Design an enzyme around this catalytic site. Structure first.
Site: not given
Ligand SMILES: Cc1cc2nc3c(=O)[nH]c(=O)nc-3n(C[C@H](O)[C@H](O)[C@H](O)COP(=O)(O)O)c2cc1C
Ligand code: F3S
Length: 1475
Positions: A1, A31, A207, A227-228, A871, A937, A940, A946
């Site tokens: 928005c 927006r 939006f 907006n939020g 990453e 991901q 986490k 990390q």
């Molecule tokens: C050792 C390890 C490191 C990973 N590092 C990343 C990360 O750098 N960024 C990311 O988006 N996913 C990371 N993933 C997740 C993978 O992108 C993928 O989504 C995931 O492995 C799929 O699950 P699966 O192991 O059951 O096949 C990592 C997974 C593992 C096994």
């Protein structure tokens, strides 16, 4: 928005304002969203004062006397189109407008032109009429509005899409509609009439995340534009709604309050609810400013800017007890008619620029250059920092954040006045009873106790869900934490803790509305705090969470009575209920059984609400069965105001008080651990975990997390959920009150009947023979590894283990139900054809050894599929196809890989953009068929990447352009995406730099994803990916692997359904992953909606992972997840193995296509109707699961077109396109030309110069260019000005810019300068937005003006001179040089880890502001420091002319004094901070 207001103080209403208001909505267009039409908008709106002149003509025509301004009063009303129904509706309005002694002068029809609406919006268009009203008694301003407020709220009980009051007041009015922004005036003719004039105007461009517009939902509301995203909505509503019966104020009648009866409601949007709540606060005697401070309070603690204002510190401390914050990012904008102004969420997650003239003509809005004033006369150019409001008052005054807050500090004060004034080893089997397990204490309680941080682990959650396992589990395990994805951001709990709190209030929440004069540091309370509290303010009936056996038979009764006991006890005066499992002292085998503390705390908390009594008391849960970080968060989540984890605390006492432990502490474990520390560590670890969990959702205060129920349950059932956990989703439905009872029995049995020596070990964390099942065992994988290595018997073994397993995920409860005859493998599409759909999924270079990583890329490239750079950046050497390969299978360019052919390439098809932006470079972006925004991901979600320092080799440090030793914890949010529009922007930046690349957005399965994806689709993304909780990691909190994110069966499905319903499904490709290791897994993902399929851990296994599970250690015995050369050398594994693996999986896909009967995976996707629930399976815990969520999807037998996508979405005609269109292709292609050009910019002009940068990047990579293209620009620049700028590129901003200047900048220069005709102090006045230089990688930026928050957020090498900043200055910076010549908000060094910064803070208050976790404040002492600081402060002047610049520069010897330099423990010894 987009949002703003415009105010005029020193004039009488004119039309121009209205004119400007509308032009401004124009610039909000990006927006905002549009429906499936691509035409109808998600909403556009405008609040003004009553256009008392325009209405004049109505009266005339009717020959009628127009009442006083203060006494006219106007309803803008949406009514049924159908004549008969519109009269029923009209009659109701009047029925009730009459019911307050008011009189109806009649209706005005509102001139409209429906011909400009888009087909959807037009189809839906209510009939719009204004009702004109008066009071014959002689009512006025306040009293009338008060009555009109009461009126609209009554009419509101019949609210319908066809029947809605937009606004009813004598002071303001709202014109709003499902139109696109510049269409607003086109539609509502009143707004293009010169008779329309106002002193102010609030405007809003909405939006939405759907495609089906509802006119009421457009949005300036009755009182605010918002907006939020309120991330805490459920809680806030639940609290607010319990206030509802005991409303009580000055002469407001008890039946007048019963009139606003339900002032808030789960089914409406956060915004309608916020507006409502805010309204109530205003109509009952507070000004919009104050009520905002009650509901959306600043973060006041540790704010050195409140030294002089102890009033407001106190008026927050007070209310902090009464009313929890409505958290989530938020720019509010409101007008009373009397007052009008704006203020920010505590965190300041939306932009808000203001502009002020000599005549106090004011202009606020999400964007800087929007209403076009004559710059020669701007007086201030400000912005709101996180917490700040700014306001106007009818009696001709602006009102900056400070007077403001003081004005309700002054009143009702009692603030700082009324405040002041306010032995055996039974333990070894108690432990069994309350569900403790060998691992719970070894792997979790202990690590917390000894190191004082909850344990870290690797890889994904291998084991099956609570409800499908055969092993016993807690009730806690059925609840997965939900977290923020696109819709709103996480916050950084470590870098930005200063903004949170775990405070909790034990008093009963009284009356919000009456400020009468008439407290736990943390939610964890020790036996001490507990004794203390049981003295306290009130006495505190224990309610037995216990119950005896036989006759009074079930947990169903015990629950019931507890509630009644509870209800009954609260009635009889009790203000705190400690629910214990330890009543009158002891826990026996006859006390045979417990009410699980989560199940109780829900029950008493919901049942009390139903009793109309929650606001009465507040809950302490005194339990054994709670030790794990998550455990605590379930509790606070469903009620508990605090917890005394008497047994956990106990299990630490026994551990430290033990010979084995006491012994190791004399040599081995850390004997820096007196029992006082072991415990002070245990809690300090519980606290960090709460902070973390809250942050996953962007929430600052446990006080907000409290009511709110930020979880999604899986396997709880219909009635169980309603009884204990009301309004939590469980789309899968299992456990009965019986069934939960039966489970607690399973480990009640085992401390009592039997014997006690050691709690049992169930292989939960780590594979074991006796214990929980795991898809990935060291054995399954060695057998698969040897299978791929050949070219069989290992598939026997391999598949075997995969038969052998119990139910593990939801797809296991399913089975096929063919609808056509079986077919022959030879009709089916080839292994070659399927394999293109596969993806290896993005594990970082740091995380994996380069051997392991480069190999996946090669096998994937070979198959013509894709791998993904994670990453980590990518080594530039990789972007080149290999010639040097020789007869042995080796090659000079990558000497560590084996089995290479000659067509090979190790370059990643997919390139990831994650929150840390680690490798993110112009050529990076440009070597890449696709680009991935990692929102989150599966291991986490709320968290960010990390990388332990151990693993940051120099190599990794070089690639990441960061420091060799140092741990890398990337930020939880992208500092770039604080909202959907924000997402939309990043995609556009990306499409902008590489128009050829498809852009994916990577989400984790969790309730709400479907709605988020709808928005991502609308934000112009090319591919959505759903990851399940299944996924792997090289390092994550163990709590997170086991507790965050739902299964991908829920994710894909939901995304697939919502997109289809919203007609967006064709807009986007769906990639699914998480625990996919098999043809059958792919087919199930396909049936469920997915078109491409991702593999991490199995690709890994196929290269030689055993499942050691030590990724975070740097020890892979096998060369896969290490950076250690010794171990890397052990890496067996050649592209050919991962190639062959994928060919197996494919083959198995072909055979499934054969039994199902279709030729091509294309024919199968979405045919959910080919699934039935399986005949064999029976669970141990419940009779069955409901699987409607997996089986009821949109029919797809015929409608298959959504399966055809356009190749790449486009940004449209963009200014850069013209730039790249003249004599420039010469300065570029003739590697060496100068070129100057000049252009006017308007703030639709986004990402300017970026595409030029790409064009150069693509032909000479980052550094190959020796040209000198200069682009000078004038006006107000859009987001991402100068992003990814290369060497040989210089950009001039005559004007100002908005957010993200120099995002990603690599090389070259960016210079920004107010326009000469300004008469203000540059240094005193803002010129750039938030998050400038974000993950800068080189280059230089100079700016006479303040900048907003996160200046140089993740700067890796960029240099800059600005003249002031907001908070978070240099946030996760890592290298480069930042020079700041003016004041600067707090938190000034959070996690900065390398690079030098030099401030100059002359109020002298800087060290109070600084973040002290790592950076050190020195006073320039080494000469080369001076020399570094000067040439910069000088350069600035040579590029700019800065006045504060020239000042210092000529009194070089004075300012240079106290004027601090920031040194990370890492530049400690360098020619510029030493000697
Ligand atoms: C050792 C390890 C490191 C990973 N590092 C990343 C990360 O750098 N960024 C990311 O988006 N996913 C990371 N993933 C997740 C993978 O992108 C993928 O989504 C995931 O492995 C799929 O699950 P699966 O192991 O059951 O096949 C990592 C997974 C593992 C096994
Ligand atoms: S579990 Fe990780 S620790 Fe090595 S064995 Fe697999 S890469």
């Amino acid at each position: 928005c987009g949002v703003g207001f415009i105010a005029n103080l020193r004039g009488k209403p004119d039309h121009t304002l209205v004119e400007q208001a509308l032009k401004a909505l124009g610039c909000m267009e990006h927006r905002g969203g549009c429906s499936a039409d691509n035409d109808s908008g998600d909403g556009a709106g405008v609040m003004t004062a009553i256009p008392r002149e325009l209405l004049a003509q109505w009266f005339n025509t009717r020959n009628l006397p127009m009442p006083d301004g203060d006494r006219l009063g106007v309803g803008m009303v949406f009514l049924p189109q159908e004549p008969s129904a519109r009269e029923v509706a009209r009659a109701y309005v009047e029925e009730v407008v009459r019911l307050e002694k008011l009189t109806v002068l009649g209706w005005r029809e509102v001139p409209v032109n429906s011909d400009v609406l888009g087909i959807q919006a037009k189809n839906n268009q209510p009939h719009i009429e204004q009702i004109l009203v008066t009071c014959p008694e002689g009512c006025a301003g306040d009293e009338l509005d008060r009555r009109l407020y009461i009126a609209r709220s009554i009419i509101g009980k019949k609210l319908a899409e066809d029947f809605y009051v937009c606004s009813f007041s004598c002071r303001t009015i709202v014109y709003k509609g499902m139109v696109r922004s510049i269409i607003l005036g086109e539609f509502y003719l009143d707004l293009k009439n010169p008779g329309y004039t106002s002193n102010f105007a609030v405007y809003h461009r909405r939006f939405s995340t759907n495609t089906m517009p509802k006119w009421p939902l457009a949005q300036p509301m009755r009182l605010l534009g918002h907006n939020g995203e309120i991330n805490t909505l459920l809680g806030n509503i639940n609290w607010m709604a319990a206030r509802e019966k005991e409303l009580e104020v000055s002469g407001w009648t008890k039946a007048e309050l019963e009139a606003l009866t339900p002032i808030v409601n789960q089914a409406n949007s956060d915004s309608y609810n916020l507006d409502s709540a805010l309204e109530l606060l205003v109509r009952t005697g507070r000004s919009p400013l104050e009520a905002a401070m009650i509901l959306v309070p600043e973060a006041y603690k540790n704010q050195p800017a409140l030294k002089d204002y102890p009033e407001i510190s106190d008026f927050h401390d007070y209310y902090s007890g009464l009313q929890e914050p409505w958290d989530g990012p938020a720019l509010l904008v409101f007008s009373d008619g009397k007052i009008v102004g704006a203020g920010l969420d505590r965190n300041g997650l939306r932009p808000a620029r203001y502009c002020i003239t000599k005549d106090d003509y004011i202009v606020l809005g999400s964007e800087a250059g929007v209403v076009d004033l004559p710059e020669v006369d701007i007086v201030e150019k400000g912005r709101l920092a996180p917490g700040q409001m700014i306001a106007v008052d009818l009696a001709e005054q602006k009102i900056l954040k400070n007077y403001q807050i003081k004005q309700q500090a002054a009143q009702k004060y009692p603030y700082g006045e009324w405040i002041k004034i306010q032995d055996a080893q039974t333990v070894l089997q108690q432990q069994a009873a309350f569900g403790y397990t060998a691992e719970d204490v070894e792997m979790v309680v202990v690590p917390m106790a000894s190191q004082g941080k909850e344990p870290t682990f690797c890889m994904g959650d291998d084991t099956p869900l609570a409800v499908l396992s055969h092993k016993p589990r807690l009730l806690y395990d059925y609840f997965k934490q939900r977290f923020a994805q696109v819709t709103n951001p996480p916050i950084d709990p470590l870098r930005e803790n200063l903004v949170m709190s775990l405070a909790m209030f034990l008093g009963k929440r009284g009356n919000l509305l009456e400020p009468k004069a008439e407290k736990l540091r943390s939610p964890l309370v020790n036996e001490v705090e507990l004794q203390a509290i049981k003295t306290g303010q009130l006495q505190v009936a224990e309610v037995s969470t216990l119950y005896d056996l036989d006759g009074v038979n079930s947990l169903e009764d015990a629950l019931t009575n507890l509630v009644k006991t509870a209800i009954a006890t609260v009635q009889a005066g009790a203000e705190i209920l400690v629910l214990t499992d330890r009543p009158n002292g002891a826990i026996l085998t006859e006390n045979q059984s417990f009410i699980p503390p989560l199940l109780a705390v829900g029950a008493v908390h919901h049942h009390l609400i139903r009793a109309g009594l929650r606001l009465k008391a507040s809950l302490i849960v005194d339990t054994a069965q709670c030790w794990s970080t998550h455990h605590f968060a379930c509790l606070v989540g469903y009620g508990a105001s605090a917890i005394c984890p008497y047994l956990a605390l106990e299990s630490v006492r026994q551990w430290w008080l033990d010979e084995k432990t006491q012994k190791l502490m004399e040599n081995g474990r850390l004997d820096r651990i007196d029992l006082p520390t072991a415990l002070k560590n245990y809690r300090q670890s519980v606290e960090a975990g709460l902070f973390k969990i809250l942050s996953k959702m962007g929430i600052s205060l446990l006080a907000s997390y409290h009511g709110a129920q930020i979880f999604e349950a899986i396997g709880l059932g219909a009635e169980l959920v309603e009884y204990a956990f009301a309004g939590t989703t469980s789309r899968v439905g299992g456990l009965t009150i019986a069934d939960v009872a039966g489970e607690v029995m399973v480990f009640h049995g085992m401390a009592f009947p039997e014997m006690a020596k050691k709690l049992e070990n169930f292989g939960f964390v780590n594979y074991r023979p006796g214990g929980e099942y795991h898809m990935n065992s060291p054995e399954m994988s060695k057998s698969l590894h040897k299978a791929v290595a050949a070219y069989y018997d290992h598939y026997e073994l391999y598949r075997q283990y995969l038969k052998d397993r119990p139910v593990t995920a939801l797809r296991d409860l399913l089975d096929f139900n063919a609808d056509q005859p079986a077919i022959s493998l030879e009709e089916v599409e080839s292994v070659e054809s399927i394999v293109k759909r596969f993806c290896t999924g993005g594990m970082s270079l740091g995380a994996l050894s380069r051997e392991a990583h480069e190999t996946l890329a090669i096998a994937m490239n070979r198959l013509g599929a894709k791998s993904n750079s994670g990453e980590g950046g990518e080594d530039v050497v990789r972007y080149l196809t290999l010639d040097d390969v020789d007869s042995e299978g080796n090659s000079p360019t990558l000497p560590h890989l084996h089995g290479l052919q000659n067509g090979d390439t190790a370059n990643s098809a997919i390139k990831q953009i994650a929150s840390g932006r680690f490798g993110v470079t112009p050529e990076y972006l440009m070597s890449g068929k696709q680009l991935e925004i990692k929102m989150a991901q599966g291991a986490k979600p709320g968290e960010g990447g990390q990388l332990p320092g151990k693993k940051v080799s120099e190599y990794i440090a070089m690639l990441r352009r960061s420091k060799p030793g140092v741990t890398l914890i990337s930020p939880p949010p992208h500092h770039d995406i604080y909202s959907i529009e924000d997402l939309a922007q990043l995609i556009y930046d990306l499409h902008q730099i590489n128009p050829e690349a498809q852009v994916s957005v990577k989400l984790v399965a969790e309730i709400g994803i479907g709605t988020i994806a709808a928005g991502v689709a609308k934000a112009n993304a090319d591919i959505i990916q759903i990851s399940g909780h299944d996924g792997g990691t090289g390092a994550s909190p163990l709590s997170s692997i086991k507790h965050a994110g739902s299964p991908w069966e829920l994710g894909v499905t939901e995304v697939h359904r919502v997109l289809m319903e919203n007609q967006l499904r064709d807009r986007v490709l769906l990639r699914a992953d998480g625990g996919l290791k098999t043809g059958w897994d792919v087919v199930m993902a396909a049936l469920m909606g997915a078109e491409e399929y991702g593999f991490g851990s199995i690709a890994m296994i196929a290269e030689g992972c055993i499942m050691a599970r030590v990724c975070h250690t740097n020890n892979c015995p096998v060369g896969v997840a290490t950076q250690q050369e010794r171990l890397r050398q052990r890496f067996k594994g050649v592209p050919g193995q991962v190639v062959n693996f994928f060919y197996f999986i494919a083959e198995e896909v072909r055979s499934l296509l054969a039994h199902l009967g279709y030729r091509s995976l294309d024919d199968i996707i979405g045919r959910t109707d080919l699934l039935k629930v399986r005949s064999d399976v029976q669970l141990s815990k419940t009779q069955n699961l409901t699987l409607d969520c997996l089986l009821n999807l949109p029919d797809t037998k015929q409608n298959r077109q959504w399966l055809n996508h356009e190749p790449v979405h486009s940004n449209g005609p963009v200014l850069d396109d013209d730039i790249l269109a003249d004599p420039d292709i010469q300065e570029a292609i003739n590697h060496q030309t100068t070129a100057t050009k000049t252009y006017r910019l308007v703030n639709t002009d986004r990402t300017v110069g970026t595409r030029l940068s790409g064009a150069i990047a693509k032909k000479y990579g980052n550094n190959g260019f020796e040209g000198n293209i200069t682009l000078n620009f004038q006006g107000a620049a859009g987001q991402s000005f100068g992003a990814f700028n290369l060497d040989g590129m210089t950009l001039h901003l005559q004007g100002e810019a908005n957010d993200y200047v120099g995002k990603g900048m690599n090389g070259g220069e960016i210079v920004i300068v107010p326009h000469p005709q300004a008469s203000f102090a540059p240094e005193d006045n803002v010129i750039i937005g938030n998050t400038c230089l974000y993950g800068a990688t080189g280059g230089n930026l100079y700016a006479n003006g303040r900048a907003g928050e996160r200046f140089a957020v993740r700067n890796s090498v960029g240099k800059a001179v600005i003249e002031g900043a907001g908070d978070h200055c240099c946030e996760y910076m890592t290298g480069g040089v930042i020079v700041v010549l003016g004041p600067v908000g707090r938190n000034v060094g959070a996690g900065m880890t390398g690079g030098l910064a030099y401030f100059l803070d002359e109020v002298g208050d800087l060290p109070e502001k600084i973040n002290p976790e790592i950076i050190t404040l020195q006073r320039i002492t080494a000469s080369k420091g001076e020399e570094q600081l000067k040439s910069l402060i000088t350069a600035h002047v040579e590029h700019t002319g800065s006045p504060k610049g020239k000042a210092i520069l000529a009194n070089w010897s004075d300012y240079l004094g106290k004027f601090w330099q920031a040194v990370p423990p890492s530049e400690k010894d360098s020619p510029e901070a030493n000697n």
